[PDB]
Amino acid sequence: ALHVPKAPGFAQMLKEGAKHFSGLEEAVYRNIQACKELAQTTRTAYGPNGMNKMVINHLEKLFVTNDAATILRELEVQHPAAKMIVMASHMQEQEVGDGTNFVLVFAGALLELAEELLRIGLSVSEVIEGYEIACRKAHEILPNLVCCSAKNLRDIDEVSSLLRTSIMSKQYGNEVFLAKLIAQACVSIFPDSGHFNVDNIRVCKILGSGISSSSVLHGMVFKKETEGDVTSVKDAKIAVYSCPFDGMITETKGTVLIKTAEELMNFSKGEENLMDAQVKAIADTGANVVVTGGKVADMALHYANKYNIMLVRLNSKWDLRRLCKTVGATALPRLTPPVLEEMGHCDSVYLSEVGDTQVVVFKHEKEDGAISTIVLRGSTDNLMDDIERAVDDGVNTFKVLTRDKRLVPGGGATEIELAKQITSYGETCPGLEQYAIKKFAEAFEAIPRALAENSGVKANEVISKLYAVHQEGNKNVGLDIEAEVPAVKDMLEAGILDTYLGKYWAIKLATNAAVTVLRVDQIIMAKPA
Amino acid sequence: TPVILLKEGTDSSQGIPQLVSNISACQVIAEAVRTTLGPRGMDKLIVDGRGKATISNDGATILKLLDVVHPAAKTLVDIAKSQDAEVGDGTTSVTLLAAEFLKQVKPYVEEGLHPQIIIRAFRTATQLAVNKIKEIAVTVKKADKVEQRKLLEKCAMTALSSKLISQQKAFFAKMVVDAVMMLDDLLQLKMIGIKKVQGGALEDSQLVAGVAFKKTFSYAGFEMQPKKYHNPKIALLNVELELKAEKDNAEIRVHTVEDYQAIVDAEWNILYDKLEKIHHSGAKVVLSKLPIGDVATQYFADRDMFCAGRVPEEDLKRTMMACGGSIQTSVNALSADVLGRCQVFEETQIGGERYNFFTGCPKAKTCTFILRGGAEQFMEETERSLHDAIMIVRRAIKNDSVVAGGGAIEMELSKYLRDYSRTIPGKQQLLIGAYAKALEIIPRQLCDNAGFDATNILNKLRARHAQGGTWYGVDINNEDIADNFEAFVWEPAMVRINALTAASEAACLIVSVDETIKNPR
Amino acid sequence: MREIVHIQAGQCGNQIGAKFWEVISDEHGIDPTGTYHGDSDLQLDRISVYYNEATGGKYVPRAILVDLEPGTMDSVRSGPFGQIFRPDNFVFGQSGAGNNWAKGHYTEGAELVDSVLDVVRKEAESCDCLQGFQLTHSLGGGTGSGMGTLLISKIREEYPDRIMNTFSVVPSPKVSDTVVEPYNATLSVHQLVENTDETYCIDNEALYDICFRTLKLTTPTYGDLNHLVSATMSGVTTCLRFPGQLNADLRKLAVNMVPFPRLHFFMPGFAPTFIGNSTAIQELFKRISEQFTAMFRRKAFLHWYTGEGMDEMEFTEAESNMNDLVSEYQQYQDATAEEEEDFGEEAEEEA
């Protein structure tokens, strides 16, 4: 038989292993297919009824999770368009901290509809301009849907109710307990005239009993042991050092040079006397506990035991700073008797044991403090990891509420209203860009549908009833999860809400990613290495 | 198809089949340790790649030594480890419970039922069961000073009934109780030393209210110094006593031979200064974590004293706690308040080895075990058996509530849940019924391991519990049913509470997984 | 505490560094994900000298990876222990030097050394008080030798009085992989002499003749040679990384080991580590110069360098200073002076 040799020009100068795709049929449609596959991968984990997923990475580590960002991080994607979608989702996670699945669902829907718009006859530029016009209109419409702005962010009973919705979709069936725990921990440290910093909430995981035995502590817990023979204090003055608890020496090489016998006899006694004087001078200021970030010498430990000083060491360079913030102490690079202003104060310091784990606890009787800790108890490491992820989501929700106080209804009410008003706007646009606009509105129906598909009901009836009830003027009506037959419910009365800022950023980033993917026309790929 | 989404070699499974496969794998995991439960339970032998073998009856150990790689099966290993960490006993009941929970609801999963209904039913049932256990447990407020030891002895005897040392349980239980009546208020497990010496009978094991430890490496002259004292004073040290360089940074420059001789004499003068400072304090036994030279050995031998070097740190801390001194890193102030005091010190021959014994201290917060066996795995299994009793005694000292064993509490909870299920309508009724029926795998396994007819015994137990017999379980020796609260089969309620919570958590976690993805390598 | 940053240049340098870091990480308990699972805290007394701790508990190496061709970074990222490095520390070009010293030193290097100098500035900003640099490269290549030498000069300009150590491979006696190897080696030794405190010359054939005869079983590729070099480097740096009966940084070894500043070339050894100032170095250079002249007398391959900007007298100065180095080494033995040129003529008259 015969062969089709090659085409002259660029096809003959291309290296071996490289690829070149050009045109709509070889570039655009294949990208749309890849994005659709990526969206279908994570669609099933949306909402309170979304099911858990289990992933094993290339190092044989195990993840059991519902969060979309973690799932995308643990997978190994190869197609560039899916990489753009993943990067958009990660940017949304970094900017806000919740709503990394709305991005994927919306972008997939937008590209899926753009495929048929291109099939019918429209050009890519018109689709793009319609999408931008619709996005601007949606951002204009959104502020009018806001209801129930947050009133007081230092009231425990209101904060507990505001954070319940963000955790219900991760730990359905345990939302009240975790919500109350996170509310206490967050209300503890919010400072007046204060930026709320997220770092100041710490999580400690100890294997043991069920989740319901978890607790919150106003202070710190370290998984360490005491170096000395004193074990507890009842009123602690704390001195913190970043240098080793030992006799300090020259930076340049130094040798002890002796010429007579008497110096040889007296050297060790001189060193011991100096070390004793230093320890006694430190102790005379009233410090009961010394915390260091380096080595402790044997003689220094012996003299600390002589004068009843609790000695703890930890080597992280970051736990030391956080402890200094917790107790109000200032680190010292020298081994000198500290001044009163550099004293830390703690109500209790003690060594305890929880379920085979030995810990050292710095505990305050104060209600505010500077940082706080959450102690989690579970029967499996994966469960505690999932609970930690839920805690992070709740804390980020509190931070966003600090930034902006406005809430919008959830459960699909906002998306239905946006789609209705965008369709109404698009019916009055004369030109070819109206079709694109209408498609944009239809892309908002993928959010309620998914919910219904996860709840085990028929999405078409739910969407029809939502449209029918929104035609009458009820803007706060969404899907009812408890019912086994399709139904609708008032979300404002039932307290299902979500932040304005999250929805704003989600819409923006999803539209940006979809348009960026649509703009690419031809692809040149090097050979994988 | 030209460019694929994920990397080549990624394996994905989803739907009902993968959930059914996970449930199937959990059954194999539970079968691995199924026949090790009860007074008539066997034990397993596992061999690793190098050739060493290990013989065990403890469930957590067997699960650890199995190289399980199935992601759904690893959860049962994790819950067993957690149960071992928290309470220390009951690491096989939880595994069978979890497997039975999965197996009883497998058929409903096959029919197409939403797993969240199953999860809700499991959570409700677990809450009800834990509340019932807390309600019906027996406790005594001001029991006694003697009725508070008998309860711990019964708990230990029950905890030892299925181990290799069962026949001598009455001999061992007593000892372990004493062991935990001296451990202060923190009850540190490092305060109890376990020593294993080959050769001897199991009835030759002993407990010393004091301390004992092995002989260390010794230089010449150790055999010329006394080996028994009656009221000695002990010096505990952290100082290296031998002729050596003062410091690694040191350097000596000298110009005359007279100063050379003086420098030579200086080192001997320093060492002898330390030795005289030790001697003049009145101590007769000296111990140090750091080496002792031969010169020091002969110096101590010439003055009728005893010395030891390179003592392990744990043993030295244990000696401090038993005798009541303090570790000294310097010899410039050896007062009377920093020395120990015992009532007898001796060095004795124990089956091919030499052991140092400090006994006769009534102020001791420490005890030490000496175990006598015939092969390495024998003493290892003896120690593993004693650990369960130690942990049970510690847990029983704080919270003192007791429930009856043998399966009485399982059948009581099953009856309660079945009576509750008939009240509520819907699929919740069937799911609570399945949960109630899954609780009687413990008495069935006891009867099966013993070699009885389980159906007849289960029918009699169900009839006895439905009528009225709260504490009725299986009598293994008489091959029948009997009251297990008057036969003294007692166990703390924490074991059952933790087992139920852990098993329910594992079942709920396994049921809620939709699909599995494996990445290459 | 007295941090050291490590720089790898070229294919050989990258291959050696990828195993150096692998054999270090297992000692300190680090994982390929960056976490820590060690047992003894003695591993953490001097952990900060080589690893920078990030928020969240990860440890990242203080390393910069450099080459003019993107081939080797793709392998490094795709290989083992290749995901703990900072993703922003990979610097690469688009063409490559093609085993030309002049292209690496003048044309392609000059437009990329600025990126390396902007990365080392950010890596130095995070250390409390740095003490020196580690460099790994080759003398027979273009990117390894010329570009590496230019980088050494630039670092010496930017950081005046910080120590600098190199681990350079050297051409083999009876086999030369590249035709222009003498030129590159001679032109790089000139500027290795005056800009480093110590150099650890490593030969390929000498260490290559250990796997066949001592290891009893091999027909290997560069592979295990690289692992042996990494083991030698770890045995060298254990003093810096770990405390012992007498800990001493590389300066505290050099001061006892280097009496005269310009004679700072060593020959290693390994007995499972030995480092020696054996004057058998004077035998290696005597060979290289012997080749250099033999080619320079014929002006062979000269137009490949002259076209890039270099002048003819640079070779003359390089060979003159190589001869000076050889004579300085020879003046320490007084026994090789017995082997002077045998007299051939017959004029042995009055005086």
Ligand SMILES: Nc1ncnc2c1ncn2[C@@H]1O[C@H](COP(=O)(O)OP(=O)(O)O)[C@@H](O)[C@H]1O
């Ligand atoms: N009680 C509830 N009933 C119905 N829908 C809910 C309820 N609680 C939360 N949701 C919905 O869950 C959706 C998001 O869940 P989640 O899986 O966290 O997605 P994402 O991670 O993208 O926010 C929200 O759009 C919200 O409307």
Ligand SMILES: Nc1ncnc2c1ncn2[C@@H]1O[C@H](COP(=O)(O)OP(=O)(O)O)[C@@H](O)[C@H]1O
């Ligand atoms: N004398 C006894 N008569 C009947 N059953 C007993 C007796 N002693 C112990 N058991 C039963 O043995 C079971 C536990 O056996 P074991 O191997 O210890 O399992 P686990 O380690 O999980 O407790 C308990 O359910 C307990 O009721």
Ligand SMILES: [Mg+2]
């Ligand atoms: Mg969410």
Ligand SMILES: [Mg+2]
């Ligand atoms: Mg048991």
